[PDB]
Symmetry: C3
Subunit: 226 residues, 3 copies
């Protein structure tokens, strides 16, 4: 079963394979109600735009929530080096962005110290650098966690693959209007499925689930974040 063959993206192939072969990868899912964030963004957005020059989007809220969650689950921010578990005192988050040569993992450094606008600007900066092929190796080295968004592609739900030597990875998805049960009443809300794939050798059930629940919580009450 072979009609045309092109010679080899073989290294990455090895990385992905070993990624899946060297870790006990599992996925835990959940859903978040984007209504609140969308409201904030509706009322404070234009103001934020002018007073900060950058536009207020969702990504900043995710990164902020993720940082908060990381601070409560150090194992998730940790890494496993052959017989040792390396914990991290810093918060560097790899952010998957798409380039014509595939996705790239630009690292957002010390995001715990960045404010909303700063994160919004840097994310932009990296997005453009990726488009122009100006992304430096410095920008692509590091990161304790990864936030990947397939919602841009229309993805409903999926199983993200861990990017070694990281322990977990969070996958954002498409925001769809969904009939939901709020107060024994059914109301349509802009729901989104979160998918966290984690290396079970380090992170366990209660923790991955806790981590994800935390994100859902903070995101459903932005005030308690922003």
């Amino acid at each position: 079963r072979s009609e045309k063959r092109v010679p080899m993206r073989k290294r990455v192939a090895e990385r992905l394979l070993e990624a899946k072969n060297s870790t006990a990868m599992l996925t835990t899912f959940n859903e978040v109600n984007m209504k609140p964030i969308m409201d904030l963004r509706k009322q404070y957005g234009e103001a934020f735009e002018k007073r900060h020059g950058i536009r207020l989007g969702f990504m900043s809220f995710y990164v902020k929530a993720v940082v908060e969650a990381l601070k409560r689950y150090p194992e998730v921010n940790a890494s496993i080096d052959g017989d040792d578990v390396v914990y991290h005192n810093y918060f560097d988050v790899s952010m998957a962005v798409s380039t014509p040569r595939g996705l790239v993992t630009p690292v957002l450094r010390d995001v715990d110290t960045l404010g909303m606008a700063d994160i919004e600007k840097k994310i932009k900066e990296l997005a453009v650098k990726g488009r122009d092929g100006k992304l430096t190796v410095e920008d692509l080295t590091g990161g304790n966690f990864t936030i990947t968004n397939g919602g841009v592609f229309g993805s409903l739900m999926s199983t993200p693959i861990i990017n070694p030597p990281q322990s977990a990875i969070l996958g954002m998805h498409a925001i769809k209007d969904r009939p939901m049960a709020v107060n024994g009443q059914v109301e349509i809300l802009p729901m989104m499925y979160l998918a966290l794939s984690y290396d079970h050798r380090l992170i366990d059930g209660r923790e991955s689930v806790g981590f994800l629940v935390t994100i859902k919580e903070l995101l459903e009450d932005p005030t308690r974040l922003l």
Copy 2:
């Protein structure tokens, strides 16, 4: 304690030799179900075979394959032909009868061949029909499966999993209406197929299936 050999090895190596991931989605079966009631009986008489869903899936899959060659490829050997393995159940387990050149078959033809293979599987008359296929369509809906993670059948790159059609309250035009929804699950070998592509492939299927009057054109 108390009291599939090669297949066991195949499945293991299948999962051990590929970076398998799964992307899910949902499709609204209402439209297809409508043509089916409106032209079905006619189709039945004028074509002798009954119009079912499977033909639409195969057709949509072929269309999708034509737009995502990597998905029709193998690890990288690309394919100029469209042979689709179709998992059918025999008393000795599931079997992968191959539907050849489905891009050239019309609705009725696919409906007949699928039948043919289904029966041959029941009678154990399926010939080593079992060799080939660039993709695989597996349907667990017959078993009542809501959603699941299909396993890739080497040396294929991806596999699509059909599921049970359940009535689900949905949001259509800021209004909630019950529609016969179905979850699609595409497991793909990430060494060859990436995110945007698997998701694209699946979105394409959803689209074509939600508008049969476009698939046929």
Copy 3:
């Protein structure tokens, strides 16, 4: 100031890896309507007349036993295929040192209250670190509940040398289609991960559908 502190479960790490590396693990999902069981819970009476409180876990174990009896492969094991004539079910419970798999033995012979009591017994022994190795050895199947943690849906990992594992989850109110009418029901997602080298599609799905059925009609589970 910016340090990568390497702290010196490695066995467990090996187990989990080999667990995922030695089996063709796949996951099949489904949903169950908890309304009926919640209605029986007939609870206060049970409480007094049996001293223990009637919860959900007993119903799950009972349903699982029933399902096991119909799908022996799921109760089997692959040794390098050992079937089991007994029904011992590992029940994942959480201890400060992680989850533990206390085994419930011969659950097919235990009645509602008995299962309710033993589950309790084991839960406490786990809290006090009094869980014996005897309690932790054996089990043909495993029931794990992440609902306690708020988990919506997930992919459970098989505990070798077992063949499958059932994952309970959070009970959320969900708008559903009942009789062409939309009604909110306390739905729950079930996730069954199974070793495909032994258990196939029709069987895992059948097993799971069986559980859904029995659970949606407990007055076919109160006494068998």
